[PDB]
Nucleic acid binder design. Structure first.
Ligand code: MG
Ligand code: MG
Ligand code: MG
Ligand code: MG
Ligand code: MG
Ligand code: MG
Ligand code: MG
Ligand code: MG
Ligand code: MG
Ligand code: MG
Ligand code: MG
Ligand code: MG
Ligand code: MG
Ligand code: MG
Ligand code: MG
Ligand code: MG
Ligand code: MG
Ligand code: MG
Ligand code: MG
Ligand code: MG
Ligand code: MG
Ligand code: MG
Ligand code: MG
Ligand code: ZN
Ligand code: ZN
Lengths: 126, 79, 48, 136, 192, 182, 49
RNA sequence: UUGCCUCCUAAAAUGUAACGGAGGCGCCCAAAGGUUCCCUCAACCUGGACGGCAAUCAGGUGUUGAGUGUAAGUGCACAA
RNA sequence: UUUCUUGCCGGAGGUAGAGCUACUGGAUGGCCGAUGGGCCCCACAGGGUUACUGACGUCAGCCAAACUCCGAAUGCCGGU
């Protein structure tokens, strides 16, 4: 036995991320016609869901664990743009072109910005 | 031989103005209050002096949402 | 690591008086130091 | 005399003096006690007189618990004055007593002396009380 | 040391309320409720006189044998709602119990004997909680005072506890404290 | 292509030392040092606002980074101290500046003590976060002696992932820290 | 007064559009802010009179 | 004493009198206004040269006991 | 008939009562025992002895128009 005493950086990252997410969520939400594009991000993968908060359901989703996205030899920005175009295509198939961006409690930029601008050019107006 | 008090202010007529199940117009103010004793609910907005008003026509109904008393406007069906 | 606000920091060569050579980095603009009492000199450090 | 060190408000309304004592109706500290039967305002004057009466009677060794505190002030406007000009200045202190509340409690070896000291105290109070024992 | 249960009669309350309870209390009857793991809160009138008699004979804590319309049940007095003034018992609570069943209870502690003369013995906690079987419940247990030395405290952990019974209270709950008898120049110095 | 030396020796021998004499189930439970914090708590600058200048200058030269100025977040009547007054200066060191500063202290500056008798092993806050002070800024050769103006002490804190003083002390000794031997 | 009433006038048309207050002890100089001019049609600097 | 604001009286909607019980107001802030983003205090224990419970540093416990220009009340840690 | 009554349904309260280890204050008696009190060896180090005063805490019983973790009956708003 070796009882640890401190708090781990995982806890502070996770719950501070959740607090930022909730503060954000106080002001955006998803309908059927203008759903919410929520994003997760880790050291390996980036995830997106298209949510109708009236139900708590998901309309479309994507991540960087699909076959094609793992088929890219490029950079994390390349995976981000691939996910963005894929989720834009899936949303357009589902019958929607307007959305609100839930950045997920991460600062807007880097790969999240790349994803968001890929979806922007791909057909989703936000 | 004199009282050093004897002053008060006007009553501000605060309180709930529309109760549960009451049909309102869009824009009717529903509860006058000081702080946020009732928090704005679905399709209900909050004014500058923390006055709750209805952002859509419907029926008033109260609720609790994560330990917060809230006021909501419910869309009644069109006859 | 800001642009230039921090004080100048470069690698430095530190030589002991009793013959020890320290390969270090400091803010010395010269980058050269010699010290006569070091980790092998004090009676408390090496029991002498 | 029993006087609170400070009260948040020094001019309160008269204590509502209705109902039966719900809290503080049992003998817990000593073995014999004086337990009330009428609503009243027991001032610190009454309490001090009753306590000294008990101490004079037993006079040897035994514990007297005054488990009521006079901490409610009754005011009185100065004499010869008409009505008005605001409420008076507080000038006596009171415990609000309901029928049921044990007022004084006593611990002492024997029986008759304890009973007699308790009734000596009772005679100093503005109410009817009765001597109650530690058992049902 | 099994204690023989006491045999009362009871009959189901037809209708409930403050009016019904007042009337029943007026006819020399006590309203009461059975519960426990019998999982049926059953509302029972019982004889007030016999209830008081058995509570006198065997304290607050005593097993009863209730005859509910012919059915035979074992009960144990859980609580008694009593008027502060008229002292009549108003209501009773009856856990259902059976043999070989541990139950938590509160037993009065009555100091026995005389103490050393220069000081007075005074109890702070008159009741001590014990875990014990339904039949083996002691109605009272004693604490020893026989010429103690100068003032000292007594706690529940050093009591001669009966057999088959277990202390529940934390052992460091004071029960009886011998405190030096106030002198002539010490008794009237406190209280003002 | 280049690394600090003392971190090298740490990884090379102290990790195995701590593992084999503290016997962790997880190799990541083998402790280590995390950060150091140097604080010049000036405080008396409630009147002389100009002393914190020399404070931050000398602390910058020794540490290699520019201190954040620490104000006072309370109003107190005694010390002539009002809210928002610069009272102290602190720098945190992590990584290469971390290890190099530890070098400049323990291999150089801490030997420069006059009347050195070690540092007490009972100087831990219950979990192995070792914090010691002093009262002269002239044991650091980064600063010349006559160039000083007032005798000032630092505040040197080494914050490590010890579970208790045993890990903290074993680590500090393993890093080569000349404690007081009580 | 220490917080007197002041007026703000557009520079490019000299029309007095707004009246406000400010502290003379804290803002000794004329206060100037980009306000909205109804006849200039756009936001213009406005300077204290 | 006379206008305004807050509380109790005031009897769980609103309103409610007395020379009833307590206090504030006749301002202040070009940021103490707008928006964007980020953070969580007070207190307590332990370890530190001045430095003392107390000043700044580090570790922990700490869900609100701190703070909110300004009385009081209603609020606010989702933070106001 | 929009009025009013009665039944049912949808509401918001903080009164009566109660409770307080749920806050703000008052307040009874115990228990351990500080810090600060005195003394010994003898230093103003350090240690222990002593009516010590006895922080904090804790056990049990209480109190409040301007206290509330709670909390009715009635009344009130609407519908039927
Ligand atoms: Mg740590
Ligand atoms: Mg008012
Ligand atoms: Mg506003
Ligand atoms: Mg306004
Ligand atoms: Mg009343
Ligand atoms: Mg009672
Ligand atoms: Mg009560
Ligand atoms: Mg009498
Ligand atoms: Mg300015
Ligand atoms: Mg009202
Ligand atoms: Mg009313
Ligand atoms: Mg009137
Ligand atoms: Mg005035
Ligand atoms: Mg603001
Ligand atoms: Mg702003
Ligand atoms: Mg902290
Ligand atoms: Mg009706
Ligand atoms: Mg109803
Ligand atoms: Mg309700
Ligand atoms: Mg109220
Ligand atoms: Mg009441
Ligand atoms: Mg109070
Ligand atoms: Mg009340
Ligand atoms: Zn040397
Ligand atoms: Zn213009």
């Amino acid at each position: 036995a070796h009882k640890p005493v401190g708090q781990n950086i995982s806890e502070v990252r996770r719950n501070a991320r959740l607090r930022r997410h909730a503060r954000l969520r106080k002001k955006v939400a998803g309908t059927a016609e203008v759903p919410r594009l929520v994003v997760n991000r880790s050291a390996r993968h980036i995830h997106v869901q298209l949510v109708n908060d009236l139900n708590g359901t998901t309309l479309a989703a994507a991540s960087s664990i699909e076959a094609d996205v793992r088929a890219i030899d490029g950079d994390k920005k390349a995976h981000s743009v691939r996910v963005g175009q894929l989720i834009a295509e899936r949303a357009k198939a589902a019958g929607v072109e307007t959305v609100v961006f839930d950045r997920g409690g991460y600062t807007y930029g880097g790969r999240i910005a790349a994803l968001a601008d890929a979806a922007r050019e791909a057909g989703l107006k936000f | 031989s004199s009282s050093r008090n004897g002053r008060d202010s006007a009553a501000q007529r605060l309180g709930v103005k529309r109760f549960g199940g009451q049909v309102v117009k869009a824009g009717e103010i529903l509860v006058r209050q000081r702080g946020t004793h009732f928090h704005p609910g679905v399709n209900v907005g909050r004014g500058g002096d923390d006055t709750l008003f209805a952002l859509a026509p419907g029926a008033v109904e109260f609720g609790a949402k994560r330990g917060r008393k809230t006021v909501n406007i419910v869309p009644v069906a069109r006859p | 690591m800001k642009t230039g606000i921090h004080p100048e920091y470069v690698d430095t060569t530190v030589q002991c008086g009793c013959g020890h050579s320290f390969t270090t980095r400091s803010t010395k603009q010269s980058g050269t130091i010699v010290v006569e009492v070091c980790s092998q000199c004090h009676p408390f450090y090496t029991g002498k | 005399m029993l006087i609170p060190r400070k009260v948040k408000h020094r001019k309160q309304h008269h204590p509502e003096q209705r109902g039966i004592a719900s809290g503080g109706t049992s003998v817990s500290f000593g073995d014999y006690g004086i337990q009330a039967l009428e609503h009243a305002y027991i001032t610190n004057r009454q309490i001090e007189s009753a306590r000294i009466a008990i101490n004079r009677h037993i006079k040897r060794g035994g514990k007297v618990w005054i488990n009521i505190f006079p901490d409610r002030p009754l005011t009185k406007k100065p004499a010869e004055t008409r009505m008005g000009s605001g409420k008076g200045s507080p000038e006596w202190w009171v415990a609000n007593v309901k029928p049921g509340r044990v007022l004084f409690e006593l611990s002492y070896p024997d029986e008759k002396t304890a009973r007699d000291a308790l009734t000596r105290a009772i005679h100093k109070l503005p109410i009817k009380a009765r001597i109650v024992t530690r058992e049902e | 040391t099994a204690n023989i249960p006491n045999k009362l009669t009871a009959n189901v309350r037809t209708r409930t309320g403050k009016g019904a309870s007042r009337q029943a209390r007026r006819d020399g009857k006590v309203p009461a409720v059975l519960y426990g793991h019998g999982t049926d809160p059953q509302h029972l009138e019982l004889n007030a006189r016999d209830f008081a008699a058995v509570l006198r004979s065997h304290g607050t804590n005593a097993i009863l044998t209730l005859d509910i319309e012919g059915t035979e049940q074992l009960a144990l007095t859980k609580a008694l709602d009593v008027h502060p003034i008229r002292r009549n018992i108003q209501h009773a609570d009856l856990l259902v119990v059976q043999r070989g069943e541990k139950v938590t209870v509160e037993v009065t502690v009555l100091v026995e004997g005389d103490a050393t003369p220069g000081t007075l013995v005074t109890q702070d906690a008159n009741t001590i909680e014990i875990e014990a079987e339904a039949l083996s419940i002691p109605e009272q247990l004693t604490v020893s005072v026989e010429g103690v030395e100068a003032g000292t405290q007594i706690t529940a952990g050093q009591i001669s506890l009966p057999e088959g019974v277990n202390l529940i209270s934390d052992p460091e709950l004071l029960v009886v404290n011998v405190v030096e008898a106030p002198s002539a120049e010490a008794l009237e110095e406190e209280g003002a | 292509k280049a690394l600090p030396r003392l971190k090298q020796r740490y990884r090379e021998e102290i990790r195995e030392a701590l593992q084999q004499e503290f016997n962790y189930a997880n190799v990541m439970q083998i402790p280590g040092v995390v950060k150091v914090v140097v604080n010049m708590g000036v405080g008396d600058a409630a009147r002389d606002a100009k002393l914190i200048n020399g404070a931050i200058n000398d602390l910058a030269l020794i540490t290699g980074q520019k201190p954040e100025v620490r104000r006072a977040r309370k109003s107190i009547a005694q010390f002539k101290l009002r809210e928002g007054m610069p009272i102290g200066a602190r720098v945190t060191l992590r990584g290469d500046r971390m290890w190099e500063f530890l070098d400049r202290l323990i291999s150089i500056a801490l030997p420069r003590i006059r009347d050195f008798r070690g540092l007490s092993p009972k100087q831990f806050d219950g979990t192995g976060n070792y914090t010691f002070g002093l009262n002269e800024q002239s044991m650091f050769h980064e600063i010349d002696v006559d160039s000083i103006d007032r005798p000032r002490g630092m505040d040197i804190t080494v914050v490590t992932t010890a579970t208790n003083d045993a890990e903290g002390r074993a680590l500090l000794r393993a890093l080569g820290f000349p404690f007081k031997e009580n | 007064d220490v917080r007197p009433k002041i007026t703000l006038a557009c520079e490019v048309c000299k029309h007095r559009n707004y009246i406000t207050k400010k502290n003379r002890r804290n803002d000794p100089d004329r206060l100037e802010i980009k306000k909205f001019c109804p006849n200039c049609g756009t936001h213009q600097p406005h300077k204290e009179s």
